[PDB]
Amino acid sequence: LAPVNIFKAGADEERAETARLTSFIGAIAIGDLVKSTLGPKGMDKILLSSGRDASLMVTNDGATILKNIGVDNPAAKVLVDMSRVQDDEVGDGTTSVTVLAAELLREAESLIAKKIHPQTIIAGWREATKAAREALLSSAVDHGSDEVKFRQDLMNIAGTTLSSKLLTHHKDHFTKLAVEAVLRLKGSGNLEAIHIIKKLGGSLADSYLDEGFLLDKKIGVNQPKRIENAKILIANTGMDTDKIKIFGSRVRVDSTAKVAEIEHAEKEKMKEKVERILKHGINCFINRQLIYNYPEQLFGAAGVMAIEHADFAGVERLALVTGGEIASTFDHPELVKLGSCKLIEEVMIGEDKLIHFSGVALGEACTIVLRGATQQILDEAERSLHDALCVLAQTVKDSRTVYGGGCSEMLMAHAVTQLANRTPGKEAVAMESYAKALRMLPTIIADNAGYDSADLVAQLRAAHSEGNTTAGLDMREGTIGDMAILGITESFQVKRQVLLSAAEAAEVILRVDNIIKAAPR
Amino acid sequence: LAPVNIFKAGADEERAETARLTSFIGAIAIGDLVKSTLGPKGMDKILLSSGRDASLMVTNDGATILKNIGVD
Amino acid sequence: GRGKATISNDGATILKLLDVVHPAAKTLVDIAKSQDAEVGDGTTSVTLLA
Amino acid sequence: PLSVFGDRSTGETIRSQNVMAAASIANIVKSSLGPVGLDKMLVDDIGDVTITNDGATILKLLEVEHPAAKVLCELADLQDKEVGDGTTSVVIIAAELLKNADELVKQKIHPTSVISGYRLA
Amino acid sequence: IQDGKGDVTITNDGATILKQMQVLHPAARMLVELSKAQDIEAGDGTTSVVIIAGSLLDSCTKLLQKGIHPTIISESFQKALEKGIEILTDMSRPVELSDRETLLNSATTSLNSKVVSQYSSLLSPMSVNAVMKVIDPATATSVDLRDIKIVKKLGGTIDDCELVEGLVLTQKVSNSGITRVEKAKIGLIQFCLSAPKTDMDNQIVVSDYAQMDRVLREERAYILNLVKQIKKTGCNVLLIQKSILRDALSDLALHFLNKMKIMVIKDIEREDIEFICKTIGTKPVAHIDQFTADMLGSAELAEEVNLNGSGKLLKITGCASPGKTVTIVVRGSNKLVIEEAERSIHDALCVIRCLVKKRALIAGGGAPEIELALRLTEYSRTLSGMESYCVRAFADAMEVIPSTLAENAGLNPISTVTELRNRHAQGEKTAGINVRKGGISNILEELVVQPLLVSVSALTLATETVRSILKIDDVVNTR
Amino acid sequence: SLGPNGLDKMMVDKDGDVTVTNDGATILSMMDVDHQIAKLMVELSKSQD
Amino acid sequence: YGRPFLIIKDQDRKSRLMGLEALKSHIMAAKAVANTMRTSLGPNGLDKMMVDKDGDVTVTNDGATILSMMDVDHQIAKLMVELSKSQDDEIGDGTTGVVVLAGALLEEAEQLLDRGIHPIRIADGYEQAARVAIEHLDKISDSVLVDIKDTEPLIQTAKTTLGSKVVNSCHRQMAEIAVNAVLTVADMERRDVDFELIKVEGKVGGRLEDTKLIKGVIVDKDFSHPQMPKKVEDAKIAILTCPFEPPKPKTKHKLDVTSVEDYKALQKYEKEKFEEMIQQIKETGANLAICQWGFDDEANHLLLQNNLPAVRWVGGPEIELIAIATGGRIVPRFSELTAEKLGFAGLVQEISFGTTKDKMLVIEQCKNSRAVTIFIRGGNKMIIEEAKRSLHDALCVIRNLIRDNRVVYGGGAAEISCALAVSQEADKCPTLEQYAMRAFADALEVIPMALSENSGMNPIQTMTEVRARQVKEMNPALGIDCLHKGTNDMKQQHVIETLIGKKQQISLATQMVRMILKIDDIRKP
Numbered sequence A: 001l002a003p004v005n006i007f008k009a010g011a012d013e014e015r016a017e018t019a020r021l022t023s024f025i026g027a028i029a030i031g032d033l034v035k036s037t038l039g040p041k042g043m044d045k046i047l048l049s050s051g052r053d054a055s056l057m058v059t060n061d062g063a064t065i066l067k068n069i070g071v072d073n074p075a076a077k078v079l080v081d082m083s084r085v086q087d088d089e090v091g092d093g094t095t096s097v098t099v100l101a102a103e104l105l106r107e108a109e110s111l112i113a114k115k116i117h118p119q120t121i122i123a124g125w126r127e128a129t130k131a132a133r134e135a136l137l138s139s140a141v142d143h144g145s146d147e148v149k150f151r152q153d154l155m156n157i158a159g160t161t162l163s164s165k166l167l168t169h170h171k172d173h174f175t176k177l178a179v180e181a182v183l184r185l186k187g188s189g190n191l192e193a194i195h196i197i198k199k200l201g202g203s204l205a206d207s208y209l210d211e212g213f214l215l216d217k218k219i220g221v222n223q224p225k226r227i228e229n230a231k232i233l234i235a236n237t238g239m240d241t242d243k244i245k246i247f248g249s250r251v252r253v254d255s256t257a258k259v260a261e262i263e264h265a266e267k268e269k270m271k272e273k274v275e276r277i278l279k280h281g282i283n284c285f286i287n288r289q290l291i292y293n294y295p296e297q298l299f300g301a302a303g304v305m306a307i308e309h310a311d312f313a314g315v316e317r318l319a320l321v322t323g324g325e326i327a328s329t330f331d332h333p334e335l336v337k338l339g340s341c342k343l344i345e346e347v348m349i350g351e352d353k354l355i356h357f358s359g360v361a362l363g364e365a366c367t368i369v370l371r372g373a374t375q376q377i378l379d380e381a382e383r384s385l386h387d388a389l390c391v392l393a394q395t396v397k398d399s400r401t402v403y404g405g406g407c408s409e410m411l412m413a414h415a416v417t418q419l420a421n422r423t424p425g426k427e428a429v430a431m432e433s434y435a436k437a438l439r440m441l442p443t444i445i446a447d448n449a450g451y452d453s454a455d456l457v458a459q460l461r462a463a464h465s466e467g468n469t470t471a472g473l474d475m476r477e478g479t480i481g482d483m484a485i486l487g488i489t490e491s492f493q494v495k496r497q498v499l500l501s502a503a504e505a506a507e508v509i510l511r512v513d514n515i516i517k518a519a520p521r
Numbered sequence B: 001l002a003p004v005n006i007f008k009a010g011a012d013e014e015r016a017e018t019a020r021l022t023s024f025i026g027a028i029a030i031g032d033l034v035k036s037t038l039g040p041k042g043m044d045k046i047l048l049s050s051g052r053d054a055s056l057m058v059t060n061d062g063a064t065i066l067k068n069i070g071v072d
Numbered sequence C: 001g002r003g004k005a006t007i008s009n010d011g012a013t014i015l016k017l018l019d020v021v022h023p024a025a026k027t028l029v030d031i032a033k034s035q036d037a038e039v040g041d042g043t044t045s046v047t048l049l050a
Numbered sequence D: 001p002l003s004v005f006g007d008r009s010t011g012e013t014i015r016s017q018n019v020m021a022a023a024s025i026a027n028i029v030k031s032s033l034g035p036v037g038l039d040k041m042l043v044d045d046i047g048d049v050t051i052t053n054d055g056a057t058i059l060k061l062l063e064v065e066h067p068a069a070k071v072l073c074e075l076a077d078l079q080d081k082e083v084g085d086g087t088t089s090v091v092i093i094a095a096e097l098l099k100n101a102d103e104l105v106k107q108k109i110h111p112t113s114v115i116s117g118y119r120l121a
Numbered sequence E: 001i002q003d004g005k006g007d008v009t010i011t012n013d014g015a016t017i018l019k020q021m022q023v024l025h026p027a028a029r030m031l032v033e034l035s036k037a038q039d040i041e042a043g044d045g046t047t048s049v050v051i052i053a054g055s056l057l058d059s060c061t062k063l064l065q066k067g068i069h070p071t072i073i074s075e076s077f078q079k080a081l082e083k084g085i086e087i088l089t090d091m092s093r094p095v096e097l098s099d100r101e102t103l104l105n106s107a108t109t110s111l112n113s114k115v116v117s118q119y120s121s122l123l124s125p126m127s128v129n130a131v132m133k134v135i136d137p138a139t140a141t142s143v144d145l146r147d148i149k150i151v152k153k154l155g156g157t158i159d160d161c162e163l164v165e166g167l168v169l170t171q172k173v174s175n176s177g178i179t180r181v182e183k184a185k186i187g188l189i190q191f192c193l194s195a196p197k198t199d200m201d202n203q204i205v206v207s208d209y210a211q212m213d214r215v216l217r218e219e220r221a222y223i224l225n226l227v228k229q230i231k232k233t234g235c236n237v238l239l240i241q242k243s244i245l246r247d248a249l250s251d252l253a254l255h256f257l258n259k260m261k262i263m264v265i266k267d268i269e270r271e272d273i274e275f276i277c278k279t280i281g282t283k284p285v286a287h288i289d290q291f292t293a294d295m296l297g298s299a300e301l302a303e304e305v306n307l308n309g310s311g312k313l314l315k316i317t318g319c320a321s322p323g324k325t326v327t328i329v330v331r332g333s334n335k336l337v338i339e340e341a342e343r344s345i346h347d348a349l350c351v352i353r354c355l356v357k358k359r360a361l362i363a364g365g366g367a368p369e370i371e372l373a374l375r376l377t378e379y380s381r382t383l384s385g386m387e388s389y390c391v392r393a394f395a396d397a398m399e400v401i402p403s404t405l406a407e408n409a410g411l412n413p414i415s416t417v418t419e420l421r422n423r424h425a426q427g428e429k430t431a432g433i434n435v436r437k438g439g440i441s442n443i444l445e446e447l448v449v450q451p452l453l454v455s456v457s458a459l460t461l462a463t464e465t466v467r468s469i470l471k472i473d474d475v476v477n478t479r
Numbered sequence F: 001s002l003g004p005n006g007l008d009k010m011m012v013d014k015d016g017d018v019t020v021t022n023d024g025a026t027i028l029s030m031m032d033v034d035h036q037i038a039k040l041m042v043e044l045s046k047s048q049d
Numbered sequence G: 001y002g003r004p005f006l007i008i009k010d011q012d013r014k015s016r017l018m019g020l021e022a023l024k025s026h027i028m029a030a031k032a033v034a035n036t037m038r039t040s041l042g043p044n045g046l047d048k049m050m051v052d053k054d055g056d057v058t059v060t061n062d063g064a065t066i067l068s069m070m071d072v073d074h075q076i077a078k079l080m081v082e083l084s085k086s087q088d089d090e091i092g093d094g095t096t097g098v099v100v101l102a103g104a105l106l107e108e109a110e111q112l113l114d115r116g117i118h119p120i121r122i123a124d125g126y127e128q129a130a131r132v133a134i135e136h137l138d139k140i141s142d143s144v145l146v147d148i149k150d151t152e153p154l155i156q157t158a159k160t161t162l163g164s165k166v167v168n169s170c171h172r173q174m175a176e177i178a179v180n181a182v183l184t185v186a187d188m189e190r191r192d193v194d195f196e197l198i199k200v201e202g203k204v205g206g207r208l209e210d211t212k213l214i215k216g217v218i219v220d221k222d223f224s225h226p227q228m229p230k231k232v233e234d235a236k237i238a239i240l241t242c243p244f245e246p247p248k249p250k251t252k253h254k255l256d257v258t259s260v261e262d263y264k265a266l267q268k269y270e271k272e273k274f275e276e277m278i279q280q281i282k283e284t285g286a287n288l289a290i291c292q293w294g295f296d297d298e299a300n301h302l303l304l305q306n307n308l309p310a311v312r313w314v315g316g317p318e319i320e321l322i323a324i325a326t327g328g329r330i331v332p333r334f335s336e337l338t339a340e341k342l343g344f345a346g347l348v349q350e351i352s353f354g355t356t357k358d359k360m361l362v363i364e365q366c367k368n369s370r371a372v373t374i375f376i377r378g379g380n381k382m383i384i385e386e387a388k389r390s391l392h393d394a395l396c397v398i399r400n401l402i403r404d405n406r407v408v409y410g411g412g413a414a415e416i417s418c419a420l421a422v423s424q425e426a427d428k429c430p431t432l433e434q435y436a437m438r439a440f441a442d443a444l445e446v447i448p449m450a451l452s453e454n455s456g457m458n459p460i461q462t463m464t465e466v467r468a469r470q471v472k473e474m475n476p477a478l479g480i481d482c483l484h485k486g487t488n489d490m491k492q493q494h495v496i497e498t499l500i501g502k503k504q505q506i507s508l509a510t511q512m513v514r515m516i517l518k519i520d521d522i523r524k525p
Ligand SMILES: Nc1ncnc2c1ncn2[C@@H]1O[C@H](COP(=O)(O)OP(=O)(O)O)[C@@H](O)[C@H]1O
Pocket: A037, A038, A039, A040, A061, A092, A093, A094, A095, A096, A097, A160, A161, A163, A164, A165, A404, A405, A406, A473, A475, A488
């Protein structure tokens, strides 16, 4: 460079070749590290820490690994941010999109090494992505009028999503549990209303789904435990010293009898408020705040169960399940809309006591009990169940399923090849690289399965070129089977988002040829 | 790696992946360092040193450059 | 201290390669050497009996 | 193998160490048992003379980092709190019993049979 | 075990040893969680499951070196686990809760591998009675272990442990003079007995000596009125909870309560109110207008006791409404032996709870292990090649428990295993290793048995942990 | 970074933030240099923007 | 107060271990060594690369050389290296197979030790199984004939042994060169050879296919004068030891010159003795004299004028090699140089290489010589060393074959037959010692499994198929098809090995296993 220094001491400046080489090396390393967990027969990863009291966890998806590792390469930071955005959006396609981006960058490296302008490569990649999205929009299945076919498609999607994790051994029950939990929402986007309670101990077969609701709280003292018929009512008031105000009042008297009379008046006011609370004719009071001794004994002397310490999520779940309404003030008993329940008791799951709720009217939300050995297995099961619920809600809101496995990628590659075989110029190199990446995307899964990847890829390409646009890959034997008969079906929105994110990341990283680092603090 | 120490202190050993990766990286670097002087329209390089008597030579042959560089 | 292995089943070589500095523990090495120089057989039996 | 991040023994080394510690604790207060024994002296860092020979006070003001020593000290303290007399004889008897049981353990005898015989006796 | 702070702990349970070992390897950091889950679910067999998992992971080395895919190995292991569970269910023995000898044998079987091997005859019937008093033979499906309080006290030996069917307090009383009352009425009080202070910022403005005297006069009058209202109900033993804000008891109130011949115990926490209300049968009182009515109760003898010289202790024996709660008073010289006896009692209670919840009995020792090994060896000859090899490797790992039991007894392990395998394939199937005779005979004659649910859960957890290990094969360091 | 065929620039912050932009003003501003001429040019670009 | 007493010197620095943990660590180290030295077994195995202390690069696959330059510090590894070196010095073929068998036997005995068997009983059972295998291996042995005409079995065995190195593209000619050198230096009247007679020299530059056998003596020197004739057709070798200088005694002599007459007499006698020795060199009838030390100016000029080339600086074994090949005698002085003490030379002509200034003189067309030279040519530095190591291994294999005058069928059938015989003999041993024989039989099948793993097929499936085919038919010549030829019969695939070598390997492995199972203590600083 120039002998006259411009930057400060400790600030580097990578030019066009060094920065591109560093970004390509980082992308290749990220792809090689993330390619181990892609196919259904993948393995697990151990993410141990050294400053956070040695946090041990076991994950399978690449998003958690990318969020827990945290490197310093900006080319890898872009992919990490893209994976995090995709996880926050849909949460099912991170390893696939990052592998596609790594393959695109690896192809762009060899393209630049062949003395090719980056603008032509960007234009070819944009044209290939447009052709792929057009082919994907043209080849789509719309199911919404039929109910049995829609349920079968949902079950197949849930099974294909759960088979990629550690739930392949109990997929015969977890898929049905997720299907039953999804239908309880009545077609709503209330994914946070489904509570997942994980308890240590027991096998995976004991993870049963309760049709009612479960609460890990404790009722008051001197109160009946089980109730034959009750009416739950949710309140939002403060029974522990109701005097929280901004009023700067003070007692300026001159006798202890006056203070005693003031205390007696406060106790009488509290008793009147408690009586007005029970004026609605209820018998199962639930408060979101704390309950002292006087209201507890007042509710116990009348034979009314009082439950304290309730969060906002539990209150919302109880209001959505029992159909109640959060009321306060307690002055209009004609407008309150109480709940309805015909079964209240306490069960013993493991070594703790939880209130069992059953016989509700609505029941939009539901609790899921998870039983496992270690904490890592339970965390992985909870993450897989959450991802399955998310993808099920997504494919329900979309109401359109597309056969996955490897047919969509081959169709997109064939469309890109057909588009490139009509236009001249140097734009055919970028389309050729895109088709090669789309054909190599299932090759990683074929190699991770343990069969001949090249022969299967060639057979799939021949089947897609001969006129059969329904073939795919069989994981139970290693041959070529029909995707519409086995049950390998994914989603359209997830694949479209993955393709668009990969194209955007490729266009962003390819348009970078300078890195100016500042002085570290 | 086995927890029982076998080799002496200050001796590393690469298995199959790391060894092949390092060998390929070194081969690519060696091939790219001399690739600029291959065609008829190639240029020349500068092989300066500091441990000898400040010798400065400019040649176009690849073997001389490879012998004067002193790779590891 | 040089890195050479010394494998021997006889107790005399083991006591010689131990290099004991205790004034009271040197009595076993002396009788062991005496027994090895006399007949050269029971070198550990005398130590066990003592 | 087995990352424990510390130190460990085997089987007989810990027993020998415990026996030696018990013997040392017994010999510490073995000159003030009978009526013909003399007293001891305990001096701290600032210079405080403590002339006593009850045994329990000497064991309490000893500060030993050994598990068997602390066990014997707490046993003597419990004996002195429950009764008050005979704080060193019990420790000496326990040390002698441990020394006698060590010889049986070294003779390829299971400790359960020795414990049952001691309880029966 | 010696920690970094200087605490020396002596325990025999494998779960506690694994928790106090503090490992750093993930393969070792999963075994402690496995043992914790096994102790939470069942309670016993925390060391057998770890031994089985280690034997399986060691036998998996041969299958990994031979060249077998981990999915086939996991499927074969799941099939072998299902077959073993089916065999154990078919070989189960029915048993009811009316047989008191079976419960005593099951309680004394888990009290011979620790220091309480010479005092099991006193801890097993007491635990059996404590279990029978809490639960009911009506239709109880589980045993609530939270209704039994364990009281530890230093002093005496282990044979001095008894069972009190009442409320036992560790603290003393706040009254001097009256420490033994024959007929007393216990009354729970949750409100303070001091100066009247409202929740708001209250203050008294005095500008004359007349008001200065009137304030004290009114305070004394209010204290006397409260004392008379408490004495009007006819109570003798008062229980005041702990108050962090205002004072729960003053000097004048205490003097008046002592003059009224009322015992005051102002040392009750906010976490043992339900236990006391379920044991002595009372109701919490928070207002002075309710302590006069039905909120009272009745009891029998409630007098404190004294130990040999380590503190006082309260004992309330005899109540008008007996509940389903009980407490155990564990004694001992050293604290290590006290915690060991407490852990042994907890293990016995967990074993009894599992036996009640399962209502299934099986022979102990090493008979089920060798039986399952023989059944798996006789089953591998009906499969293919890889499945047969996997079943054989799974069956060979089950011979570690009998070998360890024969080695710990002082006999030849190989000869004992051979004799047990030869005797289990000729008629009898309930033959185990006898540590008293020194050979191989019928294990059902030594009055030693073990529950089936504990072993089933241990085997299932071990198989799950083994299947979860083969799925992981990468260690990446994070921040 | 001038024209329709110009590529973008990747800037690295002090804390570790990555900012990829094409505007020359922000690029010159986020360069914490030390020469007087570079600072004068950065100020000129800021005034122009 | 138990005061600690000082026993051993520097007790606060050394560490003492019990025994079981030491045995487990030794077994783990042996298993790791066997796993590391496992890929270099079979024709499909790759080569290794080592780095010296200064910075030299060495690539080979002999096994013993890889372990000799490994630089370890765990005693057991040094013991394995010493065992491999002893095996290479004794036999020469199979340096890593013995350590692989030892590691497999130790891994198999680890299970029996963890079960509850005494190590002495395990060692006794292993020794009994090794003795049974040795006694059984000699039953299926076939004797071959050795003659100067039929050289087919030796060539086949040399091709089979050299079928795993990188010089397999030319081992067809290397085997013929080795068998020709063996037939030249055979010495059948005493059944022994001499490696000092065969000169193995190599040089960079050229091709690998330029390796040929020379029935003469080659040197790395040139002529004393550049104008001397290079090539000759009929010349006689005159080996000499004294230099071309005037005689000088080794004692303390002093020459006193007190007049011009003495100086003139000395100056005349110098040239007189020079001319006398020059005429004596010529009168013997030889045409090419060979000295040892340097020459001079007048002597070189007289030799050039009298037309007589000569070679300087040959004080090494070159003089002995020339005297053995040409058959000429050696004279200490010039007066004893007779016509009968001269060697017959056929073709003495130097050869030129590339653009370098290196010239080497080679003699050919000799009589019945007993020493030959092997010229190695290549394009790399490690290639010459690998070719020399392969030639030495082939020579050792042929020497062992001549000493044993019988061969066997190896590859992957001898070990299977030995394991089957051990398993059959273990069925009649109900004295607890049946567990060691089964372990020895299971550990003996580690060679076919490793071969199938290095090839790229199922190890256990191929091993079971081979065992079934051997127990169904009656032919102990069924190995593992590593070259993918179709038939699994090793009798038609020309796979010939050694019997005494395998027996010595098995005995050494058993002895090392017994020695390792006995050690159970360590006291290192
Ligand atoms: N049963 C199956 N058969 C074939 N392919 C499958 C199956 N299940 C999942 N896949 C493949 O796995 C891929 C998704 O794997 P996963 O790692 O769970 O998510 P991501 O898309 O984030 O990588 C999909 O592209 C799909 O082709």
